[PDB]
Each structure stands twice: as structure tokens, then as C-alpha cells.
Curated annotation (Swiss-Prot):
Subunit structure: Homodimer, or homooligomer. Interacts with SIRPA and SH2D3C. Interacts with ARHGAP10. Interacts with DLG4. Interacts with KCNA2. Interacts with NPHP1, ASAP1, ASAP2, ARHGAP26, SKAP2 and TGFB1I1. Forms a signaling complex with EPHA1, LCK and phosphatidylinositol 3-kinase; upon activation by EFNA1. Interacts with GRB2 (via SH2 domain). Interacts with P53/TP53 and MDM2. Interacts with MYLK. Interacts with BCAR1. Interacts with PDPK1. Interacts (hypophosphorylated) with PXN. Interacts with RB1CC1.
Keyword flag Kinase: yes
Species annotation: Homo sapiens (Human)
Gene Ontology MF: a single term: signaling receptor activator activity
Span covered, complete protein: 420 to 691 of 1009
Tissue: Most abundant in the brain, with highest levels in amygdala and hippocampus. Low levels in kidney (at protein level). Also expressed in spleen and lymphocytes.
Protein name stated in the entry: Protein-tyrosine kinase 2-beta
Length: 262
């Protein structure tokens, strides 16, 4: 991709490394595609440059239907990472807007799509750390895509309401802590974008969990899905389901629900 094929139109915001813009990419076929363009401060360390490109290389290579797509990378030295932009926007707002017309089948499907992307990351022992409806983008009513990795992976040695006990307490982040967090995101999806522990302050959260308390069953949540969430919320990471098993349970629930609705 040539720099002249991307035109920047406005500031989108500042991310962890720079300097993120909204732009238009023009295809070799001539199609105009809307894009986000992440940049890295030219006035920054060796190491941040490294990390900003490391992130670009992961997103480039994941190439998963339920992970947000990288369109290209301009390496030369005002570096642009060109990401696909999704005008349906964030899942949480999408679920809010559409609560009155969405069916449970659709929410199970979204949960299943994110689970598959996670099982892929799990296969390569790659920890995402940011599995939340605010960080998932609606490509189409048929397709959701998990967003950017949690930036804490770039900080040398917080979404507290989404995090496992060992993450909060001990800064531990494993595929197992991602499973805990995935189930919170499913809770959000089955609650139409409701924020987890919305009645608590961040400091309250660890106390409630130690006492064995958990997020309640969303009203429209299939019981099977709630007991599945409750297994993900085991204090013991090793007692938690792996994403591969989650993918099988969710597919089973999807096929069950699909028959129910037709």
C-alpha cells in the first residue's frame, strides 16, 4: 500500500502510541474504503517503535473472520498502520440501540464468534486481555470482530469489573484469565450491553468475588449459558473451561436455540 492511496480526513483520537486518524484508502481496483490510521510519535523511544510494530504484525497475521482486520502497513518513517473501520460501531452501543428487535439466537451467535477468535488465540497461547462489548466491532448484523489487544501487554513490568481475581490481585494474565473475562463479555452480550458490576465501585469488586458473589443471570439468558458463565468464574483458573470446550458448548447451545426459534 502506497502512502498516496490513503488520505487522512480528521483526527479520530490518541491511542497508546500516537496519533490515530480517520482516512480513506483507495484500492488497486479503485474502491474507496474508510479506514483508521494509527501512527507512532516520531519523538518516541526505540522500544515503543518496536512494540507499535509488534502489534501491527500480530493484527496483520491473525487474519481471523472475528478479529478486526488490518488493511496494511506503511513502514517508512512516518509509519501508518491502516485498520478497517466498521460504521456499525461498537457491540455494546449496537446492542443498546437494537435491544427491542434482537433475538437470543443472535446474542448466542455473537458470543460464539468471539469464542472462536479466542480459541484461535488460545491455540498460540496468546493473551488478549480486552474482551468486552466496547472492544468488539460490528462488521455486519451477521458478524462481530474482536478489537485491539489490551495495551497492558506493552507496559514494562484497568478494566477491573471484567478481570479475573488473579489479574486484579497478582497481575496474572493467562488464557485462563481471558476465559474469565470472555464470560463477562458474554454476560454483557446477553444483557444487551449492560456494564458488569454497574452497582459497584472498582475497589468493591474483589471483595464481592471473594465472598463467592457473581454477576446475576441476565433475564433473557439461556440457563445453560449462565452455568457456563459460572464455570468461567471459578477462582481456580485450572477449573475454568478452555476456549476449545467453550466453542463446543456454545455451538451446541446455538443449534438448540436455532431449532427453538424455527
Amino acid at each position: 500500500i502506497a502512502r498516496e492511496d490513503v488520505v487522512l480526513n480528521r483526527i479520530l483520537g490518541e491511542g497508546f502510541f500516537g496519533e490515530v486518524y480517520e482516512g480513506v484508502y483507495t484500492n488497486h481496483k479503485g474502491e474507496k474504503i474508510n479506514v483508521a490510521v494509527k501512527t507512532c510519535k516520531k519523538d518516541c523511544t526505540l522500544d515503543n517503535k518496536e512494540k507499535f510494530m509488534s502489534e501491527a504484525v500480530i493484527m496483520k497475521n491473525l487474519d481471523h473472520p472475528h478479529i478486526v482486520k488490518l488493511i496494511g502497513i506503511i513502514e517508512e518513517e512516518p509509519t501508518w498502520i491502516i485498520m478497517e473501520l466498521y460504521p456499525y460501531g461498537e457491540l455494546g452501543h449496537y446492542l443498546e440501540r437494537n435491544k427491542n428487535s434482537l433475538k437470543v439466537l443472535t446474542l448466542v451467535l455473537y458470543s460464539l464468534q468471539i469464542c472462536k477468535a479466542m480459541a484461535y488465540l488460545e491455540s498460540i497461547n496468546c493473551v488478549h486481555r480486552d474482551i468486552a462489548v466496547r472492544n468488539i466491532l460490528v462488521a455486519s448484523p451477521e458478524c462481530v470482530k474482536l478489537g485491539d489487544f489490551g495495551l497492558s501487554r506493552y507496559i514494562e513490568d484497568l478494566p477491573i469489573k471484567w478481570m479475573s481475581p488473579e489479574s486484579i490481585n497478582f497481575r496474572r494474565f493467562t488464557t485462563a484469565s481471558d476465559v474469565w473475562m470472555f464470560a463477562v463479555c458474554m454476560w454483557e452480550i446477553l444483557s444487551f450491553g449492560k456494564q458488569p458490576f454497574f452497582w459497584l465501585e472498582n475497589k468493591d469488586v474483589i471483595g464481592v468475588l471473594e465472598k463467592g458473589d457473581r454477576l446475576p443471570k441476565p433475564d433473557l439468558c439461556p440457563p445453560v449459558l449462565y452455568t457456563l458463565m459460572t464455570r468461567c468464574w471459578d477462582y481456580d483458573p485450572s477449573d475454568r473451561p478452555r476456549f476449545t470446550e467453550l466453542v463446543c458448548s456454545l455451538s451446541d447451545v446455538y443449534q438448540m436455540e436455532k431449532d427453538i426459534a424455527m
